[PDB]
């Protein structure tokens, strides 16, 4: 019953995040880039967004920024899950609106722990 | 230069982290989901681990071949070889990487096959795959047609291989600079594409050990043609 | 930092990373080709190897990353008040495994009573302790009747004085300052099947000097080394 | 029933090589270095030596050499399974005795194919 908007240009990453999310019960929806990601929000509104940074066409910091502009998108929490490991990259994403930032390589159980923590409150 | 050294060190870490994330994710999932994984899913998540190690191994063999050529250990071993089979074989092996970015890979021969030559087939297969891989890696972001054609010919009592693409192309400020160790063009459209900058520095140097040369031609945002020439 | 040493370093990364890939590849092709022939607890073990050899790699890729950030000075440390006594302990646990595999015992005493407070980045000094501790195991002797690495903790000069003492190969005097240079490794005869990047101590000199601290070494060959870390209070 | 000497300084490598070898019914005996492998050869003569190059105490090129100096060690095959990718490393090991050099990372299935070939 909990929709989660998975957003990463790597098809591999998608498979395995989508697998761990479907273990808990969640209902994944997948997007190759930021543009597409934003493009599928017309369709539905998710309880969670799992956002990459480095994608083609549209970037992940750009998705986060737009997430704060439109008022229906501000309240939905973003986890950022990125290979960008700089402390400087984390602060930009947090300041751009992301609720947590997880690095890659990641632990699927922690990511899940954290995905729960946002949804449960 | 110490400048491009540091970026290179960062690029290796950047390029080795992608398969590793996979390995780590798939390996922990399998280990934490044996009861929740069916068989064709177990075998698949393993196949990813195996597949992403092979990407890793490649990238380590890039570093190693490079260092080898830097210390001039890499002597080639020449034999009579059909270059038509070599190239078919080589593109066959790039079909998966291609289809993942939706690039098609064609192959014509302007002369009739088979095309014999005195070359190390390990090492020219390596040259073909590096040029094909760059064809796939530097294709345009979205397009209906995206491609990489290899072309065979016989010019100047030698063999002339062209690897043609319709990808992003190269600014003239980097038609001389693409072959130097560590060099990459840093635009908006190469940001998230991985690579060390060594691939062509190796390919230039393998080709030059055969007594051959490689040159490039590129129209910025329309495509590129890479010319490898080896003697008979 | 010359072009020659860059080439030796590119090889060294290649060598460092090869080893866990071999495990990863060979453990993972086996599981795939032996689902019939692994009992459950040997399936779980072989995956535990894959997971653990990927951590080694990951560690290793963070050495490349940290160093690159320190080069371009992206890395700024974030200081906080920390207990150093249990910080030290926790790092010692994290090397327990690596140590035993080389039959290295790993000790800890404090000449000052615990717990010792300090304004440090705990992430970064944890990193500084592990590199010194690892090096302590990595550069142990071969013959193993009493090999160790001891972390001693004192308070000197309105500051904290961490010492990491080992009893291995020790370092030749014509190299005792060139171990902190990037890419520098000792090319001895009891030093070539020990992989490394030559970056671990460069990083650690740098983190300690982002803190306003310093590191030095006193090494008596065939006997051992002591590595002195100093940060203020 | 066949008896393989396994000579690498990596617990990890040994264990997974031992596993694939024992999949075929072969019987493994292991060695931490080159020196120990030779000390173990006095307990038994093996059908196969899987030999690493880089190990502390006593090198793997050295073992290969010393297998040429003693009598019942000359005609027992070695496969070298090493991280040393150099083409010059392979030549040395072939001319210092080794019947075959396979590189690391390796395929367990190919390795096993080649072990079989040299036992049969
Ligand atoms: N087919 C191509 N089309 C456009 N640009 C290319 C092509 N091939 C190579 N390049 C450019 O040349 C650079 C160096 O290539 P290479 O040495 O293989 O390193 P990399 O691993 O970065 O691809 C690339 O970073 C890219 O900017
Ligand atoms: N505790 C130690 N005892 C003896 N030698 C050491 C010790 N720590 C470091 N070294 C020497 O310093 C060199 C560089 O160390 P470091 O910068 O950590 O890189 P690495 O350990 O990856 O080689 C090593 O190659 C080794 O020769
Ligand atoms: Mg990406
Ligand atoms: Mg070894």
Q: What is the widest separation between alpha-carbon atoms in chain D? A: 35
Kindly give the distance from the C-alpha atom of residue B95 to the centroid of ligand 1, in angstroms, as a whole number: 19
Q: How far is the CA of C197 from the centre of ligand 2 (A)?
A: 9
Report the distance separating Cα D11 and Cα D13, nearest Å: 6
C68 to each of B14, C15, C96, D29, D94, how far by Cα in Å? Answer: 11, 19, 28, 44, 41
- Note whether D87 contacts B73, CB cutoff 8 Å: yes
Q: Please give the full DSSP string across A56-92, using - where no structure is assigned.
A: SSS-HHHHHHHHHHSTTTSSS-EEEEES---HHHHHH
Would you tell me how many other CB atoms lie within 10 Å of the CB of residue A91?
11
State the best of B68, B76, B78, B206 to mutate against chain D, taking most chain D CBs within 10 Å: B68
- Say how far residue A4 (Cα) sits from the centre of its chain: 8
DSSP 8-state assignment for residue C113 = P
Does C142 count as an annotated binding residue? no
Q: Which residues of B56-85 are buried (b: 16+ CB within 10 A; e: fewer)?
A: bbebbbbbbbbbbbbeeebeeeeeebebbe
What's the CA gap between B26 and B139, in Å, rounded?
29
User: Cβ contact (<8 Å) for A86 and C78?
Assistant: no
How many inter-chain contacts (C to D, CB under 8 Å) are there? 54
Interchain CB distance below 8 Å, C61 and B31: no
Name the H helices within C34-179. Answer: 40-72, 84-101, 122-138
Assigned CATH topology for domain C77-233: Heat Shock Protein 90 (3.30.565)
Residues whose CB falls within 8 Å of the CB of residue C187, separated by 6 or more in sequence, listed in order: none
Q: Is C61 left (phi over 0), alpha (psi -120 to 50) or beta?
A: alpha
**Cα–ligand 1 centroid distance for B138 (angstroms):** 7
Per the annotation, does D9 bind a ligand?
Answer: yes
Distance CA C128, CA C164 (A): 11
The set of residues, in sequence order, having a beta carbon less than 8 Å from that of D84 and lying 6+ positions away, is: D53, D54, D103
Q: Which residues pair with B226 in a beta bridge?
A: B163, B216
* Contact residues for C220 (Cβ-Cβ < 8 A; gap 6+): C170
Q: Which residues pair with B164 in a beta bridge?
A: B149, B225
Domain covering B1-75: architecture: Orthogonal Bundle (1.10)
| Ion ligand 4 neighbours, Cβ < 5 Å | D 9-10, 52, 54
Q: How far is B174 from chain C (nearest CA, A)?
A: 23
Instruction: Tell me the nearest-neighbour CA distance from B54 into chain D, angstroms.
Output: 10
Q: How many residues are there in chain C?
A: 233
* Chain B touched by C59 (CB under 8 Å): no
Closest Cβ–Cβ partner in A9, A57, A105 for B20: A105
Whole-angstrom CA distances from B222 to B110, B165, B190 are: 23, 8, 15
Phi then psi for B39, rounded to 5 degrees? -75, -45
CA distances from A103 to A84, A90, B32, B192, C71 (A): 7, 9, 20, 16, 21
Q: Nearest ligand to the C-alpha of residue B199?
A: 1
Task: Determine phi and psi for C217, rounding to 5 degrees.
Answer: -145, 145
Report the residue of chain D nearest B64, measured CA to CA: D85
B28–C contact, CB cutoff 8 A = yes
Q: Which CATH superfamily is domain A1-120 in?
A: Response regulator (3.40.50.2300)
**Separation between Cα atoms, residue C125 and residue C123, nearest integer Å:** 6
Identify the bridge partners of residue D101 per DSSP, sorted by sequence position.
D80
Give me the phi and psi of A57, to 5 degrees please.
65, -80
Rounded CA separation C4/B62 (Å): 18
CB C112 within 8 A of CB C153: yes
Instruction: Tell me how crowded residue C156 is: count the other CB atoms within 10 A of its CB.
Output: 11
Q: Is C138 annotated as a binding residue?
A: yes
Beta strands, E only, chain D: 3-7, 27-31, 48-51, 78-82, 100-103
Quick check: do B and D touch, 3+ CB pairs under 8 A? yes
**Contact in structure between B24 and C57 (CB atoms under 8 Å):** no
Cα–Cα distance, D58 to D33 (Å, whole number): 6
> Looking at CA atoms only, how far is residue D71 from chain C in angstroms?
30
Q: How many Å apart are CA C53 and CA D12, to the nearest integer?
A: 10
Whether C91 contacts C61, CB under 8 Å: no
Token pair recorded at residue B68? 């080898």
**Which of B146, B94, B141, B87 minimizes the C-alpha distance to B117?**
B87
CA separation for the pair D87, A17 (Å, rounded): 42
- Closest approach of A54 to chain C, Cα-based (Å): 17
Instruction: Tell me which chain A residue has its CA closest to the CA of residue B190.
Output: A56
- Neighbour tally for A58: CB within 10 Å: 18
Contact between chains at B192 and A83 (C-beta distance less than 8 A): no
Q: Which single residue is written with the structure tokens 């950047």?
A: B14
> Where on the phi/psi map is residue D46: left (φ > 0), alpha (ψ -120 to 50), or beta?
beta
Domain boundaries, chain B: 1-75, 76-232
- 3-state DSSP call for residue C214? strand
Breaks in chain A (C to N over 2.5 Å), named by the residue before each, are none
Q: Do domains B1-75 and B76-232 have the same CATH topology?
A: no
Q: Whose CA is closest to atom 25 on ligand 2?
A: C185
The highest-level CATH class for domain C1-76 is: mainly alpha
Q: Are B55 and B19 in contact (CB under 8 A)?
A: yes
B13 has binding-site annotation: no
**Quick check: D16 and C27 in contact, CB under 8 A?**
yes
> Could you give the CA distance from residue B80 to residue C125 in angstroms, rounded to a whole number?
59
DSSP secondary-structure letter at D82?
A: E
Backbone angles phi, psi at C129, to 5 degrees: -75, -40
Checking B79-82 for CB contacts under 8 A at 24+ apart, the result is B79/B118, B79/B119, B79/B120, B79/B121, B80/B116, B80/B117, B80/B118, B81/B116, B81/B117, B81/B118, B81/B119, B81/B121, B81/B124, B82/B113, B82/B114, B82/B115, B82/B116
Tell me the CA–centroid distance for residue A73 and ligand 4, in Å.
55
Q: Are D50 and D5 in contact (CB under 8 A)?
A: yes
d(CA D60, CA B37): 43
Residues with CB under 6 A from ligand 2: C 131, 135-136, 138-139, 166, 168-171, 179, 184-186, 191, 196-202, 225
- Ligand 3 center–CA A52 separation, angstroms: 7
Q: Please give all residues whose beta carbon lies within 6 A of any atom in ligand 1, as ranges.
A: B 130, 134-135, 137-138, 165, 167-170, 178, 183-185, 190, 195-201, 224
Contact between residue B20 and residue A105 where contact means Cβ atoms under 8 Å apart: yes
Q: Which H or E run contains C232? A: strand C224-232
Q: C-alpha dihedral over B109, B112, B117, B119, to 10 degrees?
A: 30
CB B184 within 8 A of CB B197: yes
Tell me, letter by letter, the H, E, C secondary structure of chain B. CHHHHHHHHHHHHHHHHHHHHHHHHHHHHHHHCCCCCCHHHHHHHHHHHHHHHHHHHHHHHHHHHHHHHHCCCCCCCCEEEEHHHHHHHHHHCCHHHHHHHCCEEEEEECCCCCCEEEECHHHHHHHHHHHHHHHHHCCCCCCCCCEEEEEEEEECCEEEEEEEECCCCCCHHHCCCCCCCCCCCCCCCCCCCCCCCCHHHHHHHHHHHCCCEEEEEEECCCEEEEEEEEEC
Question: What's the fold here for domain B76-232?
Answer: Heat Shock Protein 90 (3.30.565)
């Amino acid at each position: 019953s909990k929709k989660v908007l998975l957003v990463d240009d790597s098809a591999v990453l998608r498979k395995i995040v989508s697998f761990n999310l479907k273990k808990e019960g969640y209902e994944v929806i997948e997007a190759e880039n930021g543009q597409i990601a934003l493009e599928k929000l017309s369709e539905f509104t998710p309880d969670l967004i799992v956002l990459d940074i480095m994608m083609p066409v549209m970037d992940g910091f750009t998705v986060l920024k737009k997430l704060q502009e439109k008022e229906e998108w501000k309240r939905i929490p973003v986890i950022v899950l990125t290979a960008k490991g700089g402390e400087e990259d984390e602060s930009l994403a947090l300041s751009l609106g992301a609720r947590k930032v997880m690095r890659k390589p990641f632990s699927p159980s922690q990511f899940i722990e954290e995905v729960k923590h946002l949804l449960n409150e | 230069i110490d400048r491009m050294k540091t970026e290179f060190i960062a690029n290796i870490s950047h390029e080795l982290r992608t398969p590793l994330t996979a390995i780590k994710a798939y390996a922990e999932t399998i280990y934490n989901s044996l009861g929740e994984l069916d068989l064709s899913t177990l075998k698949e998540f393993l196949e990813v681990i195996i597949d992403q190690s092979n990407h890793l191994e490649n990238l380590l063999n890039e570093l190693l071949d490079f260092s080898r050529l830097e210390r001039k250990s890499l002597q080639i071993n020449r034999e009579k070889v059909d270059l038509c089979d070599l190239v078919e074989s080589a593109v066959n092996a790039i079909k998966e990487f291609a289809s993942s970015h939706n690039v098609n890979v064609l192959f014509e021969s302007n002369v009739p096959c088979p095309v014999e030559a005195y070359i190390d087939p390990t090492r020219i297969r390596q040259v073909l795959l590096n040029l094909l891989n760059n064809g796939v890696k530097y294709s345009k972001k979205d397009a209906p047609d995206k491609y990489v054609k290899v072309i065979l010919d016989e010019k100047d009592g030698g063999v002339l291989i062209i690897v043609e693409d319709n990808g992003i192309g190269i600014p003239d400020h980097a038609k001389d600079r693409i072959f130097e160790q560590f060099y990459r063009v840093d635009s908006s459209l190469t940001y998230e594409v991985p690579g060390t900058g060594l691939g062509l520095a190796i390919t230039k140097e393998i080709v030059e050990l055969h007594g051959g040369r490689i040159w490039v031609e590129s129209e910025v945002g329309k495509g590129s043609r890479f010319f490898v020439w080896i003697p008979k």
